[PDB]
Amino acid sequence: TTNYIFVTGGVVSSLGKGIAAASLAAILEARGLNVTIMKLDPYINVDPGTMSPIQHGEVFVTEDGAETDLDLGHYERFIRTKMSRRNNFTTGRIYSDVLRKERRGDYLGATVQVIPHITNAIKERVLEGGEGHDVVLVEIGGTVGDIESLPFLEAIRQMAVEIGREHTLFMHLTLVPYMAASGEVKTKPTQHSVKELLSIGIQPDILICRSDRAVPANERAKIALFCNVPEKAVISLKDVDSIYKIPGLLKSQGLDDYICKRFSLNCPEANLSEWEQVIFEEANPVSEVTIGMVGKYIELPDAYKSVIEALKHGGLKNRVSVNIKLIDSQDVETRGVEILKGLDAILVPGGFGYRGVEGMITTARFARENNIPYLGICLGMQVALIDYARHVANMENANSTEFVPDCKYPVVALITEWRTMRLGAQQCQLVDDSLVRQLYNAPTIVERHRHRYEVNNMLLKQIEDAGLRVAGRSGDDQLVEIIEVPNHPWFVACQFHPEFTSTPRDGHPLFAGFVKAASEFQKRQA
Amino acid sequence: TTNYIFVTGGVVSSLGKGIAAASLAAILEARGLNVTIMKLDPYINVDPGTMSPIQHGEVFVTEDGAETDLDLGHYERFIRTKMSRRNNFTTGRIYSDVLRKERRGDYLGATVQVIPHITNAIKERVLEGGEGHDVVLVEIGGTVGDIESLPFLEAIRQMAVEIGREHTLFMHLTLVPYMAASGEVKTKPTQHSVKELLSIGIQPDILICRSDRAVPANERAKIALFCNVPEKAVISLKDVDSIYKIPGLLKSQGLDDYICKRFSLNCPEANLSEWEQVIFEEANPVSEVTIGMVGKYIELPDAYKSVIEALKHGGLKNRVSVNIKLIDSQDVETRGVEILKGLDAILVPGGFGYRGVEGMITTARFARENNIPYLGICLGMQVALIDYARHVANMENANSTEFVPDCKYPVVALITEWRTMRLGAQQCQLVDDSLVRQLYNAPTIVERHRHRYEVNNMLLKQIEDAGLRVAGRSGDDQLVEIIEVPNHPWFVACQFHPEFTSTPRDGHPLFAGFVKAASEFQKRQA
Amino acid sequence: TTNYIFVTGGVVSSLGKGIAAASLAAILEARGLNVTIMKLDPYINVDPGTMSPIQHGEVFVTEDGAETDLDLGHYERFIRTKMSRRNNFTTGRIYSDVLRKERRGDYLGATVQVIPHITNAIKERVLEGGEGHDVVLVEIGGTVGDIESLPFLEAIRQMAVEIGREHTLFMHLTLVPYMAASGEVKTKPTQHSVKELLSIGIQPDILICRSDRAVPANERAKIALFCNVPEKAVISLKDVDSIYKIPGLLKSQGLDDYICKRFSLNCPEANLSEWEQVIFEEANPVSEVTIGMVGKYIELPDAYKSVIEALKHGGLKNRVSVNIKLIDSQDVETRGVEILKGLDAILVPGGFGYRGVEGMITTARFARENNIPYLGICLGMQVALIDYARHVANMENANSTEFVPDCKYPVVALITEWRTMRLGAQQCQLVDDSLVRQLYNAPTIVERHRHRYEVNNMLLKQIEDAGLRVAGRSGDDQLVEIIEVPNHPWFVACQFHPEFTSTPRDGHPLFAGFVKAASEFQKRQA
Ligand SMILES: Nc1ccn([C@@H]2O[C@H](COP(=O)(O)OP(=O)(O)OP(=O)(O)O)[C@@H](O)[C@H]2O)c(=O)n1
Ligand SMILES: Nc1ccn([C@@H]2O[C@H](COP(=O)(O)OP(=O)(O)OP(=O)(O)O)[C@@H](O)[C@H]2O)c(=O)n1
Ligand SMILES: Nc1ccn([C@@H]2O[C@H](COP(=O)(O)OP(=O)(O)OP(=O)(O)O)[C@@H](O)[C@H]2O)c(=O)n1
Ligand SMILES: *CC(=O)CC[C@H](N)C(=O)O
Ligand SMILES: *CC(=O)CC[C@H](N)C(=O)O
Ligand SMILES: *CC(=O)CC[C@H](N)C(=O)O
Ligand SMILES: Nc1ncnc2[nH]cnc12
Ligand SMILES: Nc1ncnc2[nH]cnc12
Ligand SMILES: Nc1ncnc2[nH]cnc12
Ligand SMILES: [Mg+2]
Ligand SMILES: [Mg+2]
Ligand SMILES: [Mg+2]
């Protein structure tokens, strides 16, 4: 039978709900259980594809081609269950489905109301997502006490009643502020948040308290007294330097044992050896390289969360501390190549639009002509090819049909325009003589795509003759996926997204090689 | 171990909470359990002795001398557990106790707050009241969602947590209104009341729905869905003609079985034979007499609730329907003796003050001179003696020192003034030649007193010579308790309160004889 | 006509409500208005005399002898209106008054309820406190959303309706937390607190936001949007180093102009010259002395708030930075005189009990024998006299009858025991040849007392012969109030409390002289 844990937040948002849910799922997975996580967003957007990177952050791509939130990236980094479209949906999706059915006439002339019909749709989606697992962690976005999240809370309360309270738990996150005047930690906001959740109709079973420091025992006893929660179920989660210590903290406080007691599960003791290994590797670097990431969404760092974490994972595998410096593309466009000095390696991540693309072309030129290690992802691969064709093959302002519709040299164009967006995991074939073959150590690889424009095969032969090699191709139309500069210490560009598959316990060959190249370059340049 | 049921009300007051609690206790007592009931009043009055009859109703006197509410009269009528001071207390009592302790210094210089100290006092009183019983029914006055009753609800929530939820139940009463426009019963007020109770921090276990008619099954299913309560625990209690059918209704709906399942009690099936006997006796009268009750608090009928019910009980024992007509004393004072015509018997209950006493004297005169059966209780006994002394013994305006401090003939006076209030049960000795001896059929009786002024023994010998007999006396000072007119079909006056001991299953000899005399008088006067 | 401002707090307590109310009253007083402040405490204690210093802090003594809270000390430091018993009362006081009246029978047999009677008592007290002033600031203790403060809020809502909304304002204090994760300030707790206050029935007119930093304009616009408050009435009050800058900040944000617009008051522009003078004096010290305060309540610094502020005020008058070091008396008792080294002056404040008194005697001995400046207040004066009598006059363990009832040498005793607590302001006569005469520069002074035991006049002549001089006496019994050591640079002890009369704009002669003596001692000892 399937057990459900519902995770909600109070007082303020931005408490770190996804990280805590991922850590708890990691602990449960370490005990041999089959767990999954699903995210509920109170957004009217049907999917985050329309959303821009400088509002919520990077868009995560699943194996099957769904576009989701950064939370699913967190979950895939923490557990070994592959996410899909069933692990994330919004309010807009539910309303669209119900409106479609009502227009089609599926409700047989009945009045379509919120409490029966909207909450029925929500419950159906939650059950279909959780089917086939031992434990399901359902995280509810928004703060408890807001108009936007009331249908979700009502649905989960009804679901808890229908399923049974011996298979459902409720977990509430709160903020315990610290006041420097009295020098104490205040428990009143938690009390009022529990009161609001009770007014909705849900009794918390576990209270997770978020604070700068650890919550004292007397404060936890007070919380237990005022919130109908047992004293053992008031769990403290202080701020940490590394998110990889959070499973250890929650395990030491006994959250896993309490959850297993309530759900009547007889699972062996948790083995957190891999997480301890990750902590040990992180705590003991032997070097320090600086990587320059040049992109257009520098203002909001969450636009590159997966890429930053993948660089960190590669550093962990190479036992090297990685220092990411963010460089704005328009700065390179106007100020020049001065900013790019003092960098052991350069990374150009993906993006949409023409703003800052010229700066990216300048950056690729500088890296290629200065033998600085370079990694290009999606848009970076395109700008690298454009720079190589223009300034090494003399294509006289070759560009992409994305930016200039008519430039007489469409090196990058839609597959139709060789003179719909590719989504999901695709298979790619690696050439035996290239760097990526020795990096992956496999004949073929599988990676995820979120692009529209491709590399023009008609103009590809000339650029190949100029010296640029192709390291990977698709399955049917032999679309170019990986390119490489031969006369370079390390110069790899890829059409797909490798950051959506790196994990702190396994890493990724591409980023490990990139960081190793950066370390070797700094040792050479010292 | 002791189990606790906490009974609260919502939407509106005056739902009949005490009757429902008494009926449930009756059902539990019919299964062989040791139950008790306690009442919590949100009043600032320390005790109802200061309160006037035309605000809340008659004052109930326990065996030990406590003054309480009408609810304790209900409870003593429904169960066979004697009440005391431990079964009723107010907010004012708790605050007085805590203020006394704080002034005395018992709190050792700590700050006396509401949540720790007031609720600790409340919990201590509740535990001391409930000690030594199988089940304790704690009824909380006021509506849920009011300022006045928040300390009580907080205290009972904390008590439920401390004691354990396998020994505590919460029962909520609500109003299900009926709207004649749509012709339906509305469940929304119940939903909002349950939400308010949850906001306080209590989850109901049982919902009792009050309505003119029975609540339909679909409405109950809706209530169960919206209130986290199982569908079997939504109990309908419609308006009834007789409060004696309520235990049968609650038993038929399965409330007792659910309560016994939750508390893990193995008690035999309920035997409600006596209540069925009472219903059968009530439903089948053979006669119809009319009794005139003359008093000063006629405006509020709750000022004579116990006396009215005792007359009804006597009628049930005599298989006679009793029709109580209320006559205002000042009406007799001004309009005259015209109102008292067409009455088979006359009752004068107790009271305080001089307003209307002359009308009572007129009424006693009329009854004595017309051979109409007469019953006098406390003040009625005094006015009967005054009338007999004045208009048969020629005492020339003899009165009580209560009304006129100096009248030269103090037939009624304080024990000091023979030329502090007696409270509780006292023993009395019956004379062998009198009516009350054959009525009680016992050498001695025990009854309850709530009076200050007594009968003057110095002037008693003359009135005894005039013809009036004394039927009962006290133990030490031979205070007169019962008097009788010999040349009358039925003329009994008592100093105590016999209505505080009549029950529908046992009755009372005095009221049974009074009603029988009324029936005989009507048969004679045909 | 009298205008009322009601000040409440939300989210958490300890926001600094009294300081903000005092600053606003200071601004209004700077515009020529007649203002007063009153404090409402949700305590069951009738008065803080029973409370101990290590729970809430020092007890404030008014001119008329009332014992109050530290808030009244704040108010007297900020405005020039003398407080009294009418400026502070608790829940326990209101309940005691109502219980007394109900027992006495003043309510004529009616039921005494919370909403009519308790709130009527509260309103009567508030009106009697505010009568005769232009503006009244009523501060309500407790957080909005607690059981303990609901009667106060209901009373003030009813009062606002009765008086009129053109003479009543509501001011709400909230916490705007800062989250280091996102690096933003969160407005959600303020939104929920305003919702709770609205649920009680009060619409805020002004929102005062408390935070580490200043609240940004966009956040304030959001607060205005969500809370029905105009954008100009959302006032930011960040944490400050000096509480004397708070009136300037509130004045710069336009709170005074808004309040005067709402109340239709035409008062001249605020003149905050004196507060600017205080800030200038504080910001520019020329020296740095360290003062050792030795006492028994060192654990809670609020037990000496007035004394600490008075030392700071004296330093401001002497343009000297004052560094207060707290020394525990039992430390001196056990560890010895080692702790008292490196101190330019020593202060012994008052207290009750024998614990630590021996350490105080040791400290007085050390100061007297080392010519370190010494100030003694109440208990300190007693221990100084005990030390002088024992170790200079050889009284062989002379003590107070407070500690040892029978010691054969009662230098300190009750006025009866020469072989009830003095409260309020009393007049004292200064001797012309003493230090205090040149300090006060007046024949007589008026100060406040909170003591029981006095100096024995019978044994006083011997100690006077030994060398100790008496500098002040009472009016009728010539009770000793001030003593002095002649062969000392500065050694003054007083029976009264001079810290209850020092203000940052006027200071106090005694503490100014004490701090000047400390500076001279350090210059000598350098
Ligand atoms: N549900 C509650 C809980 C507390 N109190 C009252 O609130 C006061 C406590 O002050 P406060 O410090 O604000 O409460 P804490 O529980 O200590 O909250 P915090 O942890 O933030 O300090 C006490 O007098 C108590 O009677 C109340 O009225 N209602
Ligand atoms: N907690 C709830 C429950 C009901 N609904 C909505 O309220 C409407 C139902 O109307 P109403 O008759 O007032 O609700 P009932 O449950 O039928 O209440 P009642 O028994 O009084 O008729 C439905 O559209 C439903 O979506 C809601 O918004 N919130
Ligand atoms: N009364 C309100 C106000 C806000 N929202 C929703 O809450 C979300 C905003 O998230 P949050 O940051 O928590 O709200 P803020 O107003 O920005 O609160 P804060 O200042 O603490 O960040 C929005 O989607 C909005 O639709 C809501 O449902 N009910
Ligand atoms: C994948 C990405 O960053 C988009 C690049 C470009 N706009 C495209 O191919 O769609
Ligand atoms: C018992 C009663 O009705 C009071 C009667 C008279 N006032 C008395 O004796 O106190
Ligand atoms: C005023 C003070 O500190 C008390 C000192 C001593 N106990 C007394 O006189 O009461
Ligand atoms: N304990 C924690 N410390 C830091 N960031 C967090 N995000 C979620 N939980 C966290
Ligand atoms: N069901 C009911 N009918 C009439 N009066 C009542 N008082 C309490 N319950 C009642
Ligand atoms: N703004 C403020 N800074 C510091 N302490 C305070 N107490 C009250 N208001 C304050
Ligand atoms: Mg506290
Ligand atoms: Mg309906
Ligand atoms: Mg926000």
Coordinates of C-alpha atoms in Angstrom, one line a residue, chain C residues 178-404:
Chain C
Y178 CA 15.1 39.5 6.5
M179 CA 15.9 36.1 4.9
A180 CA 19.6 35.7 4.0
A181 CA 18.8 33.0 1.5
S182 CA 17.0 35.2 -1.0
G183 CA 18.4 38.4 0.5
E184 CA 15.0 40.0 0.7
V185 CA 12.6 41.4 3.3
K186 CA 9.4 39.5 3.7
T187 CA 6.0 41.2 4.1
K188 CA 3.8 38.1 4.6
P189 CA 3.8 38.1 8.5
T190 CA 2.6 41.7 8.4
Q191 CA -0.2 40.7 6.1
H192 CA -1.3 37.9 8.3
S193 CA -1.1 40.1 11.4
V194 CA -3.3 42.7 9.8
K195 CA -5.7 40.0 8.9
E196 CA -5.9 38.8 12.5
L197 CA -6.4 42.4 13.8
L198 CA -9.2 42.8 11.2
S199 CA -10.8 39.5 12.4
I200 CA -10.9 41.0 15.9
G201 CA -12.7 44.0 14.4
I202 CA -10.1 46.8 14.1
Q203 CA -8.8 48.4 10.9
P204 CA -5.3 49.8 11.3
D205 CA -4.7 53.4 10.3
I206 CA -0.9 53.3 10.6
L207 CA 1.6 50.5 10.1
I208 CA 5.0 50.7 11.8
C209 CA 7.5 48.2 10.4
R210 CA 10.4 46.9 12.5
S211 CA 13.4 45.4 10.8
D212 CA 17.2 45.3 11.0
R213 CA 17.4 47.6 7.9
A214 CA 15.1 50.1 6.3
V215 CA 12.1 48.7 4.5
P216 CA 12.2 49.4 0.7
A217 CA 9.6 51.4 -1.1
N218 CA 8.3 48.5 -3.1
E219 CA 7.7 46.4 0.0
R220 CA 5.9 49.3 1.6
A221 CA 3.7 49.7 -1.5
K222 CA 2.9 46.0 -1.3
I223 CA 2.0 46.4 2.4
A224 CA -0.3 49.3 1.6
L225 CA -1.9 47.3 -1.1
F226 CA -2.6 44.3 1.0
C227 CA -3.6 46.0 4.3
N228 CA -6.1 48.8 3.3
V229 CA -3.6 51.4 4.6
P230 CA -2.5 54.4 2.5
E231 CA 1.1 54.2 1.2
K232 CA 2.1 57.3 3.2
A233 CA 1.0 55.7 6.5
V234 CA 3.4 52.7 6.2
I235 CA 6.2 53.9 8.3
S236 CA 9.7 52.2 8.5
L237 CA 11.5 52.1 11.8
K238 CA 14.9 50.3 11.5
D239 CA 17.1 49.3 14.4
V240 CA 19.2 52.1 15.8
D241 CA 22.2 52.5 18.0
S242 CA 20.5 55.2 20.1
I243 CA 16.9 55.4 21.0
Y244 CA 17.2 59.2 20.8
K245 CA 17.3 59.1 17.0
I246 CA 13.9 57.5 16.8
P247 CA 11.9 60.7 17.2
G248 CA 14.0 62.2 14.3
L249 CA 13.3 59.2 12.1
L250 CA 9.6 59.2 12.7
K251 CA 9.5 63.0 12.2
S252 CA 11.4 62.6 8.8
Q253 CA 8.9 60.0 7.6
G254 CA 6.0 62.3 8.2
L255 CA 4.1 60.4 11.0
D256 CA 3.4 63.6 12.9
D257 CA 2.0 65.5 9.9
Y258 CA -0.3 62.5 9.1
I259 CA -1.5 62.3 12.8
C260 CA -2.2 66.0 12.9
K261 CA -4.1 65.9 9.6
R262 CA -6.3 63.1 10.8
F263 CA -7.0 64.8 14.1
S264 CA -7.5 68.2 12.5
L265 CA -4.9 69.8 14.8
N266 CA -3.2 73.0 13.8
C267 CA 0.0 72.9 15.8
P268 CA 3.4 74.6 14.8
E269 CA 6.2 72.6 13.3
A270 CA 8.1 70.3 15.6
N271 CA 11.2 71.7 17.3
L272 CA 13.5 68.8 18.1
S273 CA 16.5 70.9 19.1
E274 CA 17.0 69.3 22.5
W275 CA 17.0 65.8 21.1
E276 CA 19.6 66.8 18.5
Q277 CA 21.6 68.2 21.4
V278 CA 21.4 64.9 23.2
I279 CA 22.5 63.0 20.1
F280 CA 25.4 65.4 19.6
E281 CA 26.5 65.1 23.2
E282 CA 26.3 61.3 23.0
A283 CA 28.2 61.0 19.7
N284 CA 31.2 63.0 20.9
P285 CA 32.7 61.7 24.2
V286 CA 36.1 62.9 25.4
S287 CA 36.9 60.2 28.0
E288 CA 36.1 56.7 29.0
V289 CA 35.5 55.5 32.6
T290 CA 34.4 52.1 33.8
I291 CA 31.9 51.7 36.6
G292 CA 31.5 48.5 38.6
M293 CA 27.9 47.8 39.6
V294 CA 27.7 45.0 42.2
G295 CA 24.3 43.5 42.8
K296 CA 22.3 40.3 43.1
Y297 CA 20.1 40.4 39.9
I298 CA 23.0 40.5 37.5
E299 CA 21.5 37.7 35.4
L300 CA 18.7 39.9 34.0
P301 CA 20.0 43.4 33.0
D302 CA 16.5 44.8 33.0
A303 CA 16.6 44.7 36.8
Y304 CA 18.8 47.8 36.7
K305 CA 17.5 49.6 33.5
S306 CA 16.8 52.9 35.2
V307 CA 20.2 52.9 37.1
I308 CA 22.1 52.1 33.9
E309 CA 20.3 54.8 32.0
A310 CA 20.9 57.3 34.8
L311 CA 24.7 56.5 34.7
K312 CA 24.6 57.1 30.9
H313 CA 22.8 60.4 31.4
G314 CA 25.4 61.5 33.9
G315 CA 28.1 60.6 31.4
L316 CA 26.3 62.6 28.8
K317 CA 26.3 65.6 31.0
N318 CA 30.0 65.1 31.8
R319 CA 30.9 64.3 28.1
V320 CA 32.3 61.0 29.3
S321 CA 31.6 57.5 27.8
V322 CA 30.5 55.2 30.6
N323 CA 31.2 51.4 30.5
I324 CA 29.1 49.5 33.0
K325 CA 30.5 46.2 34.2
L326 CA 28.2 43.9 36.1
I327 CA 29.7 42.1 39.1
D328 CA 27.8 39.3 40.9
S329 CA 27.8 39.7 44.7
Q330 CA 28.3 36.0 45.4
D331 CA 31.4 36.1 43.2
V332 CA 32.9 38.7 45.6
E333 CA 31.7 36.6 48.5
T334 CA 33.5 33.5 47.2
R335 CA 36.2 34.5 44.7
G336 CA 37.1 37.6 46.7
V337 CA 38.1 41.2 46.0
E338 CA 40.0 40.2 42.8
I339 CA 37.0 41.1 40.5
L340 CA 36.7 44.6 41.8
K341 CA 40.2 45.6 40.4
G342 CA 40.4 47.9 37.4
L343 CA 37.3 50.0 38.2
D344 CA 37.2 53.8 38.3
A345 CA 34.0 53.8 40.5
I346 CA 31.6 51.3 42.2
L347 CA 27.8 51.5 42.4
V348 CA 25.7 49.3 44.7
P349 CA 22.0 49.4 43.7
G350 CA 19.0 48.2 45.8
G351 CA 17.6 44.8 46.4
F352 CA 15.7 42.5 48.7
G353 CA 17.0 39.4 50.6
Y354 CA 20.2 38.3 52.3
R355 CA 21.7 36.5 49.3
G356 CA 24.8 38.4 48.2
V357 CA 24.6 41.0 51.0
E358 CA 28.0 39.9 52.4
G359 CA 29.6 40.5 49.0
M360 CA 28.1 44.0 49.0
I361 CA 29.6 44.6 52.5
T362 CA 32.9 43.5 51.1
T363 CA 32.6 45.8 48.1
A364 CA 31.7 48.8 50.3
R365 CA 34.7 48.0 52.5
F366 CA 37.0 47.8 49.5
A367 CA 35.7 51.1 48.0
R368 CA 36.0 52.9 51.3
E369 CA 39.5 51.6 52.1
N370 CA 40.8 52.2 48.6
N371 CA 39.4 55.7 48.0
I372 CA 37.5 54.4 44.9
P373 CA 34.4 56.6 44.2
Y374 CA 31.3 54.9 45.6
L375 CA 27.5 55.4 45.2
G376 CA 25.0 53.6 47.3
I377 CA 21.3 53.4 46.7
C378 CA 18.8 52.0 49.2
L379 CA 20.3 48.6 50.0
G380 CA 23.7 49.9 49.1
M381 CA 23.3 52.6 51.7
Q382 CA 22.4 50.0 54.3
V383 CA 25.4 47.8 53.5
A384 CA 27.7 50.8 53.6
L385 CA 26.5 51.8 57.0
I386 CA 26.8 48.2 58.2
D387 CA 30.4 48.0 56.9
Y388 CA 31.3 51.3 58.5
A389 CA 29.8 50.3 61.9
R390 CA 31.5 46.9 61.9
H391 CA 34.9 47.5 60.5
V392 CA 35.5 51.1 61.6
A393 CA 33.4 51.3 64.8
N394 CA 33.8 47.7 65.9
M395 CA 30.2 46.7 66.4
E396 CA 31.0 43.0 66.2
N397 CA 28.8 41.7 63.4
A398 CA 26.1 44.4 63.3
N399 CA 23.5 43.7 60.7
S400 CA 19.9 44.4 59.7
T401 CA 16.9 42.9 61.5
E402 CA 15.8 42.1 57.9
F403 CA 18.4 39.4 57.6
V404 CA 19.2 38.2 61.2

